[PDB]
Amino acid sequence: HMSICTSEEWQGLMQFTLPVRLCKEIELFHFDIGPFENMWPGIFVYMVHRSCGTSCFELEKLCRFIMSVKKNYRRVPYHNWKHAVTVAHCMYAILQNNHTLFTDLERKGLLIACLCHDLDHRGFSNSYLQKFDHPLAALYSTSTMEQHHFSQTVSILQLEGHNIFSTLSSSEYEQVLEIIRKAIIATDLALYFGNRKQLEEMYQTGSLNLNNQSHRDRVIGLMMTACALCSVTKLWPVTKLTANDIYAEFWAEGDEMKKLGIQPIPMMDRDKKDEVPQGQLGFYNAVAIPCYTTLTQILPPTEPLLKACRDNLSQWEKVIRGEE
Ligand SMILES: Nc1ncnc2c1ncn2[C@@H]1O[C@@H]2COP(=O)(O)O[C@H]2[C@H]1O
Numbered sequence: 628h629m630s631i632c633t634s635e636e637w638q639g640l641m642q643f644t645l646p647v648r649l650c651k652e653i654e655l656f657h658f659d660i661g662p663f664e665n666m667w668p669g670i671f672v673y674m675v676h677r678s679c680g681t682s683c684f685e686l687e688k689l690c691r692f693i694m695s696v697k698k699n700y701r702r703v704p705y706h707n708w709k710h711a712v713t714v715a716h717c718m719y720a721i722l723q724n725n726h727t728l729f730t731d732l733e734r735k736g737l738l739i740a741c742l743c744h745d746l747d748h749r750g751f752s753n754s755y756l757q758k759f760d761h762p763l764a765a766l767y768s769t770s771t772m773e774q775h776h777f778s779q780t781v782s783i784l785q786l787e788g789h790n791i792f793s794t795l796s797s798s799e800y801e802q803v804l805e806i807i808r809k810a811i812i813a814t815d816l817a818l819y820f821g822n823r824k825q826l827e828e829m830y831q832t833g834s835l836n837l838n839n840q841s842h843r844d845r846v847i848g849l850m851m852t853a854c855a856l857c858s859v860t861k862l863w864p865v866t867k868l869t870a871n872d873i874y875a876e877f878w879a880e881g882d883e884m885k886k887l888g889i890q891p892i893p894m895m896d897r898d899k900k901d902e903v904p905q906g907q908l909g910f911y912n913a914v915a916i917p918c919y920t921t922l923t924q925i926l927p928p929t930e931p932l933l934k935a936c937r938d939n940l941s942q943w944e945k946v947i948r949g950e951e
């Protein structure tokens with residue numbers, strides 16, 4: 628059912644070595660993978676090797692897994708292969724800066740979860756799928772696309788020579804699949820609001836306990852949100868270019884809605900592009916800023932993400948003022 632990489636693809640990835648200059652730059656939170664397209668698969672291998680060890684996964688299986696995942700991301704403007712590696716890199720930076728706070732199993736599970744969090748995304752939102760009673764919406768009632776992403780991830784692991792997790796004990800195998808399932812589902816932004824509220828209460832009252840599994844799950848959920856939204860933590864030019872991709876995809880969804888007799892919300896209406904700056908301002912105030920603020924309280928080393936987010940919020944305000 629899943630698309631499979633060619634022998635040339637996975638065998639070639641096995642020979643990749645990250646350039647020395649990038650080895651330094653990749654550790655920074657603001658790192659933009661954008662100008663290194665041919666290196667994206669290799670960049671992911673590198674991050675897994677540094678965070679989990681060069682022998683954590685059998686190289687051949689890891690390369691097949693990565694290239695088949697790439698092949699199963701579609702040609703959509705935003706939720707594509709580039710996005711997958713970008714989100715995985717943000718997780719890499721978070722994990723690197725909070726290394727011993729997370730178990731070996733959690734680090735490997737989370738890096739894989741990020742690479743696969745939007746696997747086989749079709750360019751359509753959950754709102755579209757549920758508003759048009761799409762098959763996927765009947766099965767996966769809530770977090771529709773996210774449940775599909777997890778199912779597709781398991782499907783790729785089931786491909787011959789692709790199960791990088793088979794060497795784990797039966798207990799840890801089940802454990803990592805659960806970590807991955809919860810992490811991918813957490814990228815359904817609808818769940819973010821309640822999760823952040825709960826974490827803020829736990830933090831403020833002092834009940835937050837990282838040794839409490841239910842609490843760990845929530846912190847990991849917030850981390851996934853922070854990574855999924857990380858385009859807002861890059862340098863302004865990069866943030867602005869990515870925003871163009873985000874809207875390109877949403878406008879295409881809006882176009883399809885119009886064709887079917889349903890008017891899209893302003894955000895997905897390309898004829899309302901002038902409202903984008905205010906739309907982003909609202910998003911930063913309602914989602915981004917609160918997200919990174921809570922993340923930084925829980926994990927101090929992630930402060931750079933919050934600083935960058937605040938900087939971009941100021942940039943959007945500048946646009947609104949006419950200082951673009
Ligand atoms: N700059 C942004 N980056 C990411 N998501 C955004 C942004 N602005 C608005 N959003 C909304 O937040 C959602 C985050 O997850 P999605 O990418 O599924 O869909 C995104 C949009 O609905």
Ligand SMILES: [Mg+2]
Nearest residue numbers: 744745772814
């Ligand atoms: Mg998604």
